[PDB]
Design a protein around this ligand. Structure first.
Ligand SMILES: [Zn+2]
Ligand SMILES: [Zn+2]
Lengths: 50, 50
């Protein structure tokens, strides 16, 4: 996985790819303050699939 | 397979800009049958925001 800062529509694109079929929930808040202002791993990103 | 997959990618991105700060919930069921085969405006997409 790209060990990078995922911000704006780049964050919803990743979530989209990782969560596949499941779907996901996007909430400008804790996913932000850490996957954007910080770096997240496949792992951490998967906390947002439905 | 291909088709709806490509299409949802285009939708999450449209729901990012529309929804803004209320975020959203993406579920490949409801949405894609509605908006992949026919055009769906920004107007129509806010159905889908939180
Ligand atoms: Zn960009
Ligand atoms: Zn495309």
């Amino acid at each position: 996985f790209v060990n990078q800062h995922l911000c704006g529509s780049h964050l919803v694109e990743a979530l989209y790819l990782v969560c596949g079929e499941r779907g996901f929930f996007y909430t400008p808040k804790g996913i932000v303050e850490q996957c954007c202002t910080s770096i997240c791993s496949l792992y951490q990103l998967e906390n947002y699939c439905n």
